[PDB]
Ligand binder design. Structure first.
Ligand SMILES: [Mg+2]
Lengths: 618, 79, 512, 51
RNA sequence: AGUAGUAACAAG
């Protein structure tokens, strides 16, 4: 008898038991070495997809940029970055016509946000890139460093605390002939440095076999990217076909709503087909100048300063410089030696050291390589513009109404800037095929390519969108991974509260099951008791705290009034996950116990601040 | 780097908690079973002394008691 | 907010063709009206840009093509099916404080040692250096008994054989590029693809033995609050009926063993960075009568732990007891050196038998992230329940009725779970739960990028097959590309090969 | 040590029947020391045979 | 040797 769990799919539908297809219990793959090869491969692919563009040498920097706009129309199904600005503007105009007044309201809200934006919003974020150190630093540290640098070379108009003032300081810093670093710097090198994108390899990434390159921008463009993202979020919030930034339950509601809307008019003589797919090479296919044109159309009849602020970001993103990472490592077996060659030395190096593929990539990247930074004018890098691309896709999605197609077929659906579900209605199979072909050609006209391998078409009723599986009205949210459910490592009460809050948040958001939540609570309680040696007073486990806990247990009368940190029973459950432990058991504590527990004169204190909220040593 | 492993390692030690010197007066140095509660050695950085969780449990089961009824009042969101 | 000269030039360099200045482009955008541009562009494009819909019939899908080559070998961190334990009965008192003395007691409980000899030699390694290690492990134990002060942890002396088996002084010296510019053989590291391997039959037996029940309890859980809401009652019923059936599965023993081994190894690496610390494999369980039981599996000798990144490799030497003759399946033990260390006396229903007891000694390596994720193997349990109730809850949605009591109380085999020459094997809910737990445990143990890629690639094929079975007329745009992507991840990992074989079997049996 | 650990009912010692010809506190200070010297075993880096 | 897989660890 050979056990085959996949045979369970013979009876149970795969949508009901899809959790067996997510091996999210092992360690995700990591990257050993440098990301220079991946970065060079990405740049070569991006420039190959635009090989029929216009090459123009820069003036301020001198790097040769590539312009694929208004290039030759594609002749095959291969990816192409040739996007016509007229088609994009027409799609934006049609989207505005279908939903009047969205752009003006979004602009007003974004202007209000800009006028009401502080400078500390840049402190919170991911690991950013520091140009002064040319390294990867936390956002707060990089912000402090650039503030000190702008204080050295006198530019101190951002001390008021407004982000607009910092943006103006960055604006004025680009015209300085000389720059000083706490290493004297001139103007051209500073301008090149300000456009540098630090490249590394993404770790802990699932669903892929080979590693991929991820880029991080500098500290100068953070505010402009923030403003652009705010505008895109404001636009998306008024669109019902977007997938961001709603939650899991809201996403399920959106799926049900769109399915019901499409199926509320389908008669017996009308056929409906649903396709699910992804977008291949999405990041390296969208020209930043297309985003610039879209933003320009967005800000029609607006103050000049606001539209200039919006347009600053695509201008810099159209002339970005990509770093080459760390470098490479060479080995000599006979001499038994290993050496490290930095990325800056790749400009002048013999090709006999590398293999065929590496030397081919180096040869292809050398003409675009200057001072250790390559030119990457076309295409986004990893994820900087998500919701703007979602707006671009939803424009094409909205372009599928009957008033525009003017044919017996018509399509709608949802998109999340990489995943898309498209449902098309037509009276016959030929109409379905014609609508699918029209949608594919329209997407190709803008720079959107549908991955044929990852896309499939069936009859309406079962489909998938962003790991949400819809089947006959039932949706399962399996787009996240369960956390470790362990101690945080601060103190007793803080760790208990944080664990309970994490369990509650996972239950309310990630659609965690009740039995699974109870099991997670049990595991967390076990880990907490083992870590803090706070076992129950009626147990037979010998620790250093065993004697004191036993004395406390035999001293008290109401056993349920003791906290878990003091050997008390675990009264937490599903219905009590929103109540702190101290307040939950407050009515069961003894008078002396509660008097001593929260005494304000305890030496440990200089959630409720009790004696368990001590401070460890560094 | 990893707070969980650091917390486990620190709790595996003898005197992980820091406290004011005043704790030298409210609680005895030795338990009735002979276990130590705090150490005379001084930490680096200030005059604070070292204290084991046994001292916390001892204070919980043996310590000054006062009429504390304001806690449910001032703390309302948690209560 | 004005634009300066440098930024003005930068903007002028960031415009579409046939646009001299940014003001001209802005004016053009401000006065634009859509006039049939999209239709004209569509007519201009050739007919080669098309997306045909290829029907997916009952004969279109083909079985996956497994790679060929030498048979795959075992690559787990410790023995799973052939592991042998030396057990002692720990009473209620004397709680577990030191594992070294427990290992010493477990070793003392055995009296059938003999002179070790090599049975299955290692091909690419120096065999005697392994043997000289094992005897040393014995000797360093006896030096404990005559020591004037009993130590907590034992650090092995860096002998000649331990220096070779732990990879000491093996990395090349780090020198600057300037001093080695002119070297005739100075090249970069060889970034070659993994060698292809062919699927073997031992992994199926391993999985089959992983789902069986044991005679001991391996997991103990704490208590929670009383049940008040009906949802709490249903959750408690589901959790209890899952735990009471899954507590005695061997996968729980594997989880506990891996968690303990990884935790001990990580602690030793953090503490003793420059010591050859000896770490024994120890597990704890509860007997049916209700008494503690401590089992010893073997020993681990850990090298240096000077780790800077999260991908640095610590080398260790693992010796594990076993009762399986390595000569039955030599290809499974390619990276193992096996000795013969004793003669166990087994008392069974047939009486007294004598079985030789071997010792599998091998050199392995691990990283910090692997050790960290090995300490969280218990989450597999948390996943397994999630794979059950979410299924059962699904059966509620189609019926608008809680089917919790309608599935656990069904005293009949209801789910197809196995394969037999007679036909598809049927099983109850408990067998399904054990199988899911074993699958999660094996995913945790054999985690690799190949498996993650293959599962994601084959999910779409599974969905297509399900849609075909639902008479929804599925269609594909490029089936060959999807098949090539699926087959790209099958290189040398036995777990992924077994999963691919399972998928092929399911595809064969789903159209009959 | 194990036999001592099996008990959990210790308390602060006090003199009940004093010795007539001897210094009573010197006895009491002895007993507490016997406890303390036991605890110093548990934190010792190397467990000794005799104390 | 071994870990590992498109490049690295096997101390600096
Ligand atoms: Mg998809």
């Amino acid at each position: 008898m050979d056990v085959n769990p996949t045979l369970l799919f013979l009876k149970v539908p795969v949508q009901n038991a899809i959790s067996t297809t997510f091996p999210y219990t092992g360690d995700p793959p990591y990257s050993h070495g440098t990301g220079t090869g991946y970065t060079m491969d990405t740049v070569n692919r991006t420039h190959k997809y635009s090989e029929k563009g216009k090459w123009t040498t820069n003036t301020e920097t001198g790097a040769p940029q590539l312009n694929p706009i208004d290039g030759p129309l594609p002749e095959d199904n291969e990816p192409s970055g040739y996007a016509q600005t007229d088609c994009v503007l027409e799609a934006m105009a049609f989207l505005e016509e279908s939903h009047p007044g969205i752009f003006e309201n979004s602009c007003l809200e974004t202007m209000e946000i800009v006028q009401q934006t502080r400078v500390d919003k840049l402190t919170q974020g991911r690991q950013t890139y520091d140009w002064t150190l040319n390294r990867n630093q936390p956002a707060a540290t990089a912000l402090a460093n650039t503030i000190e640098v702008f204080r050295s070379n006198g530019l101190t108009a951002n001390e008021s605390g407004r982000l607009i003032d910092f943006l103006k300081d960055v604006m004025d810093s680009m015209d300085k002939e000389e720059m000083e670093i706490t290493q004297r710097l001139n103007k051209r090198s500073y301008l090149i440095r300000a456009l540098t994108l630090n490249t590394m390899t993404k770790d802990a990434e699932r669903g892929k076999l080979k590693r991929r390159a991820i880029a991080t921008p500098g500290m100068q463009i953070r505010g402009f990217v923030y403003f652009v993202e705010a505008l895109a979020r404001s636009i998306c919030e008024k669109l019902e076909q977007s997938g961001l930034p709603v939650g899991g339950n809201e996403k399920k509601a959106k799926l049900a709503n769109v399915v019901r809307k499409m199926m509320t008019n389908s008669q017996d003589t009308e056929l409906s087909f649903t396709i699910t797919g992804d977008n291949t090479k999405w990041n390296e296919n969208q020209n930043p100048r297309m985003f610039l044109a879209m933003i320009t159309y967005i800000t029609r009849n607006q103050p000049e300063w606001f539209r200039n602020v919006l347009s600053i970001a695509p201008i810099m993103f159209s002339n970005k410089m990509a770093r080459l990472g760390k470098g490479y490592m060479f080995e000599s077996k006979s001499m038994k030696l290993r050496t490290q060659v930095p990325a800056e030395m790749l400009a002048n190096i013999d090709l006999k050291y590398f293999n065929k593929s590496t030397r081919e990539k180096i040869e292809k990247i050398r003409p675009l390589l200057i001072d250790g930074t390559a030119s990457l004018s076309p295409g986004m890098m990893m994820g900087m513009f998500n919701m703007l691309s979602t707006v671009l896709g939803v424009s094409i999605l909205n372009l599928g109404q009957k008033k525009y197609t003017k044919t017996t077929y018509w399509w709608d659906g949802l998109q999340s800037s990489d995943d898309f579900a498209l449902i098309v209605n037509a009276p016959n199979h030929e109409g379905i095929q014609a609508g699918v072909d029209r949608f594919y050609r329209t997407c190709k006209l803008v720079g959107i390519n549908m991955s044929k391998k990852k896309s499939y078409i069936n009859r309406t009723g079962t489909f998938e969108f962003t790991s949400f599986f819809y089947r006959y009205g039932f949706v399962a949210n399996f787009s996240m991974e369960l956390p470790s459910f362990g101690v945080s490592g601060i103190n007793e009460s803080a760790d208990m509260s944080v664990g309970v809050t994490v369990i509650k948040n996972n239950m309310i958001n990630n659609d965690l099951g009740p039995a699974t939540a109870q099991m997670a609570l049990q595991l967390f309680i076990k880990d907490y008791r083992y870590t803090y040696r706070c076992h129950r007073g009626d147990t037979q486990i010998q620790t250093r705290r065993a004697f004191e806990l036993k004395k406390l247990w035999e001293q008290t009368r109401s056993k349920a009034g003791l906290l878990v940190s003091d050997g008390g029973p675990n009264l937490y459950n599903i219905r009590n996950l929103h109540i702190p432990e101290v307040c939950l058991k407050w009515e069961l504590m003894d008078e002396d116990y509660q008097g001593r527990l929260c005494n304000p004169m305890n030496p440990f204190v200089s959630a409720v601040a009790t004696t368990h909220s001590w401070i460890p040593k560094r | 780097k990893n707070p969980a492993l650091r917390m486990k390692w620190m709790m595996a030690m003898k005197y992980p908690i820091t406290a004011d010197k005043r704790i030298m007066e409210m609680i005895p140095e030795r338990n009735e079973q002979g276990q130590t509660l705090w150490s005379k050695t001084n930490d680096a950085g200030s005059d604070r002394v070292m204290v084991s969780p046994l001292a916390v449990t001892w204070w919980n089961r043996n310590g000054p008691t006062t009429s504390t009824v304001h806690y449910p009042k001032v703390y309302k969101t948690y209560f | 907010f004005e634009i300066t000269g440098t930024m003005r030039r930068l903007a002028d360099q960031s415009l579409p063709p046939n646009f001299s200045s940014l003001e001209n482009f802005r004016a053009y955008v401000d006065g634009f009206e859509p006039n049939g541009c999209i239709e004209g562009k569509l007519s201009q494009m050739s007919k080669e840009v098309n997306a045909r819909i290829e029907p997916f019939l009952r004969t279109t899908p083909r079985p996956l093509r497994l790679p060929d080559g030498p048979p795959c070998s075992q690559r787990s961190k410790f023995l799973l099916m052939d592991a042998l334990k030396l057990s002692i009965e720990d009473p209620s008192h004397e709680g577990e404080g030191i594992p070294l003395y427990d290992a010493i007691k477990c070793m003392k409980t055995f009296f059938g040692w003999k002179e070790p000899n090599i049975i299955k030699p290692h091909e690419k390694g120096i065999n005697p250096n392994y043997l000289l290690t094992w005897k040393q492990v014995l000797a360093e134990l006896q030096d404990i008994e005559n020591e004037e002060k009993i130590p907590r942890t034992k650090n092995m002396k860096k002998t000649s054989q331990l220096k070779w088996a732990l990879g000491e002084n093996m990395a090349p010296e780090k020198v600057d590029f300037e001093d080695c510019k002119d070297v005739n053989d100075l090249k970069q590291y060889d970034s070659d693809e993994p060698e292809p391997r062919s699927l073997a039959c031992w992994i199926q037996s391993e999985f089959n033995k992983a789902c069986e029940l044991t005679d001991s309890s391996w997991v103990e859980l704490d208590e929670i609050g009383e049940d008040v809401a009906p949802i709490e009652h249903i959750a408690s019923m589901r959790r209890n009926y899952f735990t009471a059936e899954v507590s005695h599965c061997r996968a729980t023993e594997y989880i506990m063993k891996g968690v303990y081994i990884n935790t001990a190894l990580l602690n030793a690496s953090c503490a003793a960075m420059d010591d050859f610390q000896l770490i024994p494999m120890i597990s704890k369980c509860r007997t049916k009568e209700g008494r503690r039981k401590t089992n010893l599996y073997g020993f681990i000798i850990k090298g240096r732990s000077h780790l800077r990144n999260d991908t640095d490799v610590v080398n260790f030497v693992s010796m594990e007891f076993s009762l399986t003759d390595p000569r039955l399946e030599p290809h499974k033990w390619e990276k193992y050196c096996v000795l013969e260390i004793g003669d166990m006396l087994l008392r069974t229903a047939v009486g007294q038998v004598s079985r030789p007891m071997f010792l599998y000694v091998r050199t392995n390596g691990t990283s910090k992230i692997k050790m960290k994720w090995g300490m969280e193997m218990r989450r597999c349990l948390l996943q397994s329940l999630q794979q059950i109730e979410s299924m059962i809850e699904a059966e509620s949605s189609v019926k608008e009725k809680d089917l919790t009591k309608e599935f656990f109380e069904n005293k009949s085999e209801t789910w197809p779970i196995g394969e037999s020459p007679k036909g598809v094997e049927e099983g109850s809910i408990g067998k399904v739960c054990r199988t899911l737990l074993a699958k999660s445990v094996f995913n945790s143990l054999y985690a690799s990028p190949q498996l993650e890629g293959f599962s994601a690639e084959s999910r779409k094929l599974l969905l297509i097959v399900q849609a075909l079975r639902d008479n929804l007329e599925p269609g594909t745009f490029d089936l060959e590309g999807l098949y090539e992507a699926i087959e790209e991840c099958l290189i040398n990992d036995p777990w992924v090969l077994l999963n691919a074989s399972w998928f092929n079997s399911f595809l064969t049996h789903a159209l009959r």
